[PDB]
Amino acid sequence: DIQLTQSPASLAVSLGQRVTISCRASESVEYYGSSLMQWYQQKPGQPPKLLIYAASNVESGVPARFSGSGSGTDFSLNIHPVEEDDIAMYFCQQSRKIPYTFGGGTKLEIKRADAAPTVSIFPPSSEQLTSGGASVVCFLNNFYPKDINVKWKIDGSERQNGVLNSWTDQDSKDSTYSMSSTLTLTKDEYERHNSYTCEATHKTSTSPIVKSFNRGE
């Protein structure tokens, strides 16, 4: 099939600045003097919206700040004065061969000043322990940029199984990101150890933020 590679996977912008994202095809999508490539934007929990068709044709209704160009295999969408409403996901879509494919998308996010996460750790609740399970939860809130890593240490060494993670979308109020990390254990394994550590590595600091609690309290 025809592969569509979009880049970057995500871009941080300042409203008012120019924006340009590209889309490449593993094969040509040109057909008798015309490129059959489209651009679609999509906002969380909502259906895609057509912006450009045939590489450069600007669908009726979409602002002039938008424009598209390219041909052959290379294409690109341009939002010169990028504004609030443009913060969303952008997909690449061809109509040349079947199956008709879409690119992996490029997410435009609000550029903001770096921020270190606020980390909090919580031991399993009595209610859960009564059920034979034990979850240790850790929140890494309001940090920027998005990239962050979480490492779970038990008594002193790291754990990698039974660790489930979740990330929020960028916050509309402060433009930061948040993550939630849960380490689940059986109650017996939870009671054979004392130290539960949550360590977060983010761009802000080279020295991991460390949060932990010891049983016996």
Binding site: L50, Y100, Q128, V137, E217
Partner: protein, 224 residues
Amino acid sequence: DVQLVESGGGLVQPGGSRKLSCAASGFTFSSFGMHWVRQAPEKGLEWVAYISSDSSNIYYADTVKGRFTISRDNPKNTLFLQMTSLRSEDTAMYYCARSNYVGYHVRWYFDVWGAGTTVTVSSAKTTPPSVYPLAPGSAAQTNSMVTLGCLVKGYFPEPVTVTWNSGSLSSGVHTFPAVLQSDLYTLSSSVTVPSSTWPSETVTCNVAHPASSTKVDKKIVPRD
């Protein structure tokens, strides 16, 4: 007001079947070819099938070739997708989309999209969540702000809503998207408030899970 409103989505056991209907309203439905496009959670868009405005041609993504059949009823103006031998991976939001010609036929593009209907293929049975209070320790509190939270675990199917004090606390809240471990969903929520407020005043997380008609108000109490 050209639009498409697909319906028919819901829960299905692996191997089961389900019919999807797309209701058009505001254009010569008999002139425009139609498409079905799906999007798995957190995933991208995957074209599913296309049908002529004349039921002349119908194309399927190999991924559903011998299991899904697309059809159109020009009169009642509706598009259908018949799903059978459904698998876990068929789980996605299903979109209804009108094709369109700028120069002529081959030079087409997806013109309009409906709000879509969800389709979840699972063997899991409806299951209320377990709501566990997330409270810090006595001294291990520190600062002027304190963070508390709720762990909503092992429920099915999605969705679940969470509020703090029925909404009185909206700022400084973070409820994370659910993660599907095994065949059950798990999610969490945190809320940050001033230290001079918690132990002293109540902080409750309200969890709602309609599929099981569950409404739980878990009060966050201090740990002895």
